[PDB]
């Protein structure tokens, strides 16, 4: 694993805790530590800041799925936004097209919102 | 009432620090922001949507699907940032030459002032070129997003702009 813990989760698109491993660019969410995907490698990721009242959320958008994860605390939700931003093998150009296509639908449903 | 506030400038300028600070209260945990923030701030009985948008290079071509509709163009400079301060002429000039933003203000920070040597709001309005903008409003506001020194005077600025029309 590229990194593993426990994380809080829930989904935009209540709380449950989960068991996070990030492996190449999956992440896998496990009810059960003991018992061991989403696909990371075109995605969006940021600091919550208006989703949720919790300190220390990363939102997660793909295009299939929008959610919360809280971490432990600032840097722990700081070093988990960092390795998946790593984990992407997307070139320059495909980055550019998922990022276009993400922020674009992010758009639309805000100035519907 | 209301009003819509595009705010934009380079990546790494203090955009998204300058949306929390007025909406939070708080100095907040940022990384370059890769899409957009968009929150209401109340402020003397005006309902301002900012929408705090990315500046990374990559994604400046992104800033046109922001621009219809908007009322306020704020544009937030690193008044450290003299390697990119042409850049940032530049970057503003192409945003205003848009048909989409003919009708809006444009309100200025001059962020960072309290980095040594940061080039003060005479000094950016200079290498800015903000005097040839002679049709339309526009006003230069020295700022520190950490402190929120400045902010609230753009928003008065802002107030009075949306109050004139
Ligand atoms: N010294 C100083 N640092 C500031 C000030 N405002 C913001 N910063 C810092 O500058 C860095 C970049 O700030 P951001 O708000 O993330 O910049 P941004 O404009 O949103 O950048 P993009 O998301 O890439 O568009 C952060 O470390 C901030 O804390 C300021 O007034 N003074
Ligand atoms: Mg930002």
């Avoid at chain 1, 896998?28 to 009242?53: F, G, H, M, W």
Wanted: aromatic letters at 8%; a negative charge.
């Amino acid at each position: 694993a590229a990194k593993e813990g426990w994380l809080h989760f829930r989904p935009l698109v209540p709380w449950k805790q989960m068991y996070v491993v990030l492996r190449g660019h999956s992440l896998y969410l496990y009810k059960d530590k003991r018992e061991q995907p989403i696909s990371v490698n075109a995605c969006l990721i940021d600091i919550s800041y208006s989703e949720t009242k919790r300190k220390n959320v990363f939102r997660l958008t793909t295009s299939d799925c929008e959610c919360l994860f809280q971490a432990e605390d600032r840097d722990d939700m700081l070093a988990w936004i960092k390795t998946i931003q790593e984990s992407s093998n997307l070139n320059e150009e495909d980055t550019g097209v998922t990022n276009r296509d993400l922020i674009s639908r992010r758009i639309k449903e805000y100035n519907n919102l | 009432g209301s009003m819509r506030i595009l705010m934009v400038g380079l990546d790494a300028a203090g955009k998204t620090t300058i949306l929390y600070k007025l909406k939070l209260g708080e100095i907040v945990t940022t990384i370059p922001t890769i899409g957009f923030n968009v929150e209401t701030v109340e402020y003397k009985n005006i309902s301002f949507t900012v929408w705090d948008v990315g500046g990374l290079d990559k994604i400046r071509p992104l800033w046109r699907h922001y621009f219809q509709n908007t009322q306020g163009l704020i544009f937030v400079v690193d008044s450290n940032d003299r390697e990119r301060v042409n850049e940032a002429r530049e970057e503003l000039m192409r945003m205003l030459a848009e048909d989409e933003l003919r009708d809006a203000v444009l309100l200025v920070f001059a962020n960072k002032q309290d980095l040594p040597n940061a080039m003060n709001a005479a000094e950016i309005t200079d290498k800015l070129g903000l005097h040839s903008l002679r049709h339309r409003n526009w006003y230069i506001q020295a700022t520190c997003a950490t402190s929120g020194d400045g902010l609230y005077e753009g928003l008065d600025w802002l107030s009075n702009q949306l109050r004139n029309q």
